[PDB]
Design a protein around this nucleic acid. Structure first.
Ligand SMILES: [Mg+2]
Length: 520
RNA sequence: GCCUACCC
RNA sequence: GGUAGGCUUUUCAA
């Protein structure tokens, strides 16, 4: 009996013909929220991946899980555990339509806590289209009227329109009625324009006009000094400036001052190139100190993935799609690579013995989140995270055989990246870890395997490998399968309480692994 | 092959 | 359509 055969009825065949279990729908929801379905997986095409995921979603609703889904969606977004928003917003959209009315009413109810910025809403509304009314009109209206005039003003000027949707269309389609003078002004500004509003017009309301005026002013003035001035006075950001100003060193030195974190993160390369982040500079020193402030990273909801993508591209001196070059600053590379570990919800060590196994087979070459990072690299990063928290941990890599582990606990993130480079390839034997462990008489209480569960060699089933391990070593060893995709497969036996299914790249992954290690 | 802003 | 920034995919002051 090997992986080519089913252990029991419950099991189903992979994408390779070998047998595994089907991840619980709830768990697949999490996989989906974190990885989405762009580019699909190594075996499943993008389109069918989304279809497989859409099916599981509806299945949950069918089964009553309607409100648990929204609650989970609501929680992942607020806690910022998912790199990108599309999957969450698409999920909240499907729920916003499902048969259940409990779920639907819960979906629109959570819209303002999930759609924090215009883009989020625009993407939500567009999804509803790919799939107005009382609920919709109400939800959109509440999004604006519950805000503070002065805040809405920034929101609507920072994000005038995204993906084909403007606040002008939303305001009109929802037939909103400004809850106060401040909001009517902003609304009039949006639908009718500055002139109309300027022509039509409290201390609080004046503040709102002032601002709107500022935003209009920084687009007519030729004087750079005045631009810089307004930026200082009204905290105007990049989106507020005419793109011709974005070539001025002094504009950015003024823009960097209190630049939001994602903005700062996505423009590290450009600022270095324009000498705004010159070597040894105060500015650079400032940047590093901000990127490594866990609280602000947390406040700005900087996901570790975004850090990884920026680090990879930043040290490359040049972009992937971009077309500018810069001498990568070593202080920044050390600050980003440091920030990576602070972006995850950190936890107190348990002290247990962990065996961390990275699936490095050919399939792990598959690209994640439509980025330039592959599952191999991401799995290794997640691995480094768990290894720097629980010191008693031995890392190992595998494909269809045990391979010398290319990385170490003391390596900087970009060294672990290129090392996974030279080694990703081969077939998949997901039982090797447990098997290796027994053979080297290596003790462990927890096994964490970072895989896509597409095991395919004629060797015993990983679940079988774990049992043989328990019996042989006399340890109740548990097994945590950290998923690297949104496929619906798992080498984890649902009937074994010592086997858990978690998602890779959930900034909250650390807490789940802990709760499980500690029998919670 | 894509995102924005400005003019038209 | 013309022009200009950027692509670390859409820039979460939070
Ligand atoms: Mg493989």
């Amino acid at each position: 009996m090997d992986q080519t055969q089913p252990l029991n009825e419950k099991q189903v065949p992979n994408s390779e013909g070998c047998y595994v279990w089907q991840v619980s729908d709830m768990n697949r929801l999490r996989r989906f929220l974190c990885f989405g379905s762009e580019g699909g997986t190594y075996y499943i095409e993008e389109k069918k991946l989304g279809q497989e995921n859409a099916e599981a979603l509806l299945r949950l609703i069918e089964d009553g899980k309607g409100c648990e889904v929204v609650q989970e969606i609501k929680t992942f977004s607020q806690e910022g555990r998912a790199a990108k928003q599309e999957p969450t917003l698409f999920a909240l959209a499907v729920c916003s339509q499902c048969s259940d009315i409990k779920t639907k009413q819960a979906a629109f109810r959570a819209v303002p806590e999930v759609c924090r910025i215009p883009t989020h809403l625009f993407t939500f509304i567009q999804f509803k289209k790919d799939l107005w009314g009382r609920a919709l009109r109400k939800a959109v209206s509440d999004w604006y009227n519950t805000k503070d005039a002065l805040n809405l003003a920034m929101a609507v000027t920072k994000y005038k329109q995204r993906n084909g949707w403007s606040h002008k269309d939303l305001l009109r389609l929802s037939h909103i009625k400004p809850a106060n003078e401040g909001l009517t002004m902003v609304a009039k500004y949006v639908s009718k324009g500055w002139k109309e509003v300027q022509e039509a017009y409290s201390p609080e309301t004046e503040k709102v006009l002032k601002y709107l005026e500022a935003t209009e002013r920084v687009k007519r003035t030729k004087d750079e000094l005045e631009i810089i001035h307004l930026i200082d006075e009204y905290r105007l950001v990049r989106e507020h400036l005419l793109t011709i100003h974005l070539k001025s060193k002094e504009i950015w030195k003024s823009l960097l001052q209190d630049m939001p974190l994602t903005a700062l993160l996505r423009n590290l390369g450009k600022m270095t190139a324009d000498s705004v982040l010159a070597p040894a500079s105060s500015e650079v020193s400032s940047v590093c100190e901000r990127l490594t402030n866990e609280k602000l990273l947390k406040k700005a909801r900087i996901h570790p993935f975004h850090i990884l993508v920026a680090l990879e591209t930043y040290k490359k001196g040049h972009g992937n799609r971009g077309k500018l070059r810069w001498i990568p600053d070593t202080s920044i590379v050390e600050a980003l690579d440091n920030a990576f570990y602070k972006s995850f919800k950190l936890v107190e060590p348990t002290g247990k013995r962990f065996l961390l196994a990275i699936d490095v087979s050919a399939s792990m070459n598959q690209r994640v989140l439509g980025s330039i990072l592959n599952a191999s690299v991401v799995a290794a990063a997640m691995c480094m995270l768990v290894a720097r928290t629980e010191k008693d941990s031995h890392m190992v890599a595998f494909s269809d055989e045990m391979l010398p582990c290319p990385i170490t606990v003391n390596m900087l993130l970009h060294e672990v990246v290129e090392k996974m480079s030279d080694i990703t390839m081969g077939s998949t034997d997901c039982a090797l870890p447990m098997l290796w462990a027994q053979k080297t008489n290596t003790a462990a209480d927890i096994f964490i395997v970072f895989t896509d569960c597409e095991t395919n060699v004629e060797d015993v089933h990983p679940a079988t490998a774990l049992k043989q391990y328990r019996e042989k070593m006399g340890i109740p060893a548990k097994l945590i399968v950290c998923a690297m995709t949104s496929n619906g497969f798992s080498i984890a036996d649902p009937d074994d309480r010592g086997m858990l299914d978690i998602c890779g790249f959930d900034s909250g992954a650390l807490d789940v692994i802990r709760n499980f290690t500690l029998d919670l």
